[PDB]
Amino acid sequence: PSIQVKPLSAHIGAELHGVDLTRKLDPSEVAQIRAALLRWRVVFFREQFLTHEQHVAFSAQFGEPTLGHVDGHPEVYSISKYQALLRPWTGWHTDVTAALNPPWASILRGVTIPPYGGDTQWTNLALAYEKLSAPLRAFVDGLRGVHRFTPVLVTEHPLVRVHPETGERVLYVSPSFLKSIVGVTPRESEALLELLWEHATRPEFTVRFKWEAGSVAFWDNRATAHLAPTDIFDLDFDRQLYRTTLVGDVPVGPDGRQSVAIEGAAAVALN
Amino acid sequence: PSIQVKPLSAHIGAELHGVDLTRKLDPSEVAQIRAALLRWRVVFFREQFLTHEQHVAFSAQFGEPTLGHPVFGHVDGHPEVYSISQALLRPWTGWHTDVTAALNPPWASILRGVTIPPYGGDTQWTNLALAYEKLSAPLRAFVDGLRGVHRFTPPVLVTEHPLVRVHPETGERVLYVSPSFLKSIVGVTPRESEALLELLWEHATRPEFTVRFKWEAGSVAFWDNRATAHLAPTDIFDLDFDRQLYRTTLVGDVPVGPDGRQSVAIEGSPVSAAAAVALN
Ligand SMILES: [Mg+2]
Ligand SMILES: [Mg+2]
């Protein structure tokens, strides 16, 4: 096995070594990375100092890059450093789930990285589903949720997304964007969402990553949510990353029902 | 500065390099480690492969090691060394400050990893001085005046502590809310207590107040119990890996609140306190 896979927690995150991301990967390297990604939900690379062009080329080996602008590279979004009601789930989200087809993956690379501050976290939403009790699993299997984003996108997704490559059921509760559960009263929706969001962010479902210059994070948005840092606003250090995302398919629930657009680029550049 | 200090987050945690914990530290090294501990709340060392004797000697340069329980964590010949080898889940579950059910909780602990899984078993700490400062001004003034009852029942210890502990070395106010052991706020109704504790516990475990540490063989964590709470791993229960660590802890003083009032014992026994030291 040419690519070393070093898991970072019991059920999410792995650091990969033995691949040079500045050059085209051969088919075996692509397969190994994709397999590690499906198994560990987010994979990380260290000391991969890339140009935007190389970042796009790497991304294109795994899917179709989506189109904070970077000059000459419409696939690349700038993540630059340059009041809130706080609950345990605040800030946790899955990228652009207000859209009908949320991007299935994102690739984020660190260019200007503080000595400390600015860690990112991910949570395993396949595990979160499996760790619901059986009656709660059967219950959420049949529920739909409305995801909204206003810069206006509104989409009805299954609360349980069936992963198109692994068949796993995912608790698809994207906390920044999921606003209500369809067909239940407002208080029922509020109480159930708080229950599921508390559950989805159990520490034992998460992994935390301390960036360094040249680091790369590549995650499966069909099975995760993530948490951008806020501790970095307390420090003078600059922080600059760049992101690509891969065009996704329309989610389906355990009943085979596809998501449904309700109303509706800006969420691709921001989330 | 002979000891390199590498902070791990904006406000908590630092990895130290340039010191050999197998040999006695000179006064400058002791002072540097102590200063980094006060500033960063928990400090970490890597590739420090210690015997029990060396672990105790290191501990003794910073305080008086506690002297053990007959059974819990007991290591033959080393009363200072503790062996470390359905639930209702809330975001604060498992977060705690060690032995706060006792009148004088230990001021620090030193945990060393001997047999460490390739993955799983991370520990987290939160900065309770920062947690206090990040309460709004009216909430800070409110909790300044409150006391809390901490309880522990070994496999009974009951102490009334200030909700805000004034740190004896830095003078900082600490939101002393030890979630596993703090049971009630003195002098308010049971529902007021429940609702306020849930507010403060949610607050004290904000991710931006925390640092997470992935153990390796030979790693050491040295934390200030007067300014932190920590979270032991649960993701290891799913894995077949052996995990062996050893802990020493340093005898602490009686807490004092912003009004100068010391904590007050309500119930307890020396053996129950030793059990909490061994098990918390
Ligand atoms: Mg995002
Ligand atoms: Mg403890």
UniProtKB/TrEMBL annotation, chain A:
GO terms for cellular component: cytoplasm. It holds the Pfam family TauD. Residues 4-228 form the TauD/TfdA-like domain. Its cofactor is Fe(2+). Keywords: Dioxygenase, Iron, Metal-binding, Oxidoreductase. Mg(2+) binds at residues 93, 95, 226, 271. It comes from the Bacteria. GO terms for molecular function: 2-oxoglutarate-dependent dioxygenase activity; metal ion binding. Belongs to the TfdA dioxygenase family. This is Taurine dioxygenase.
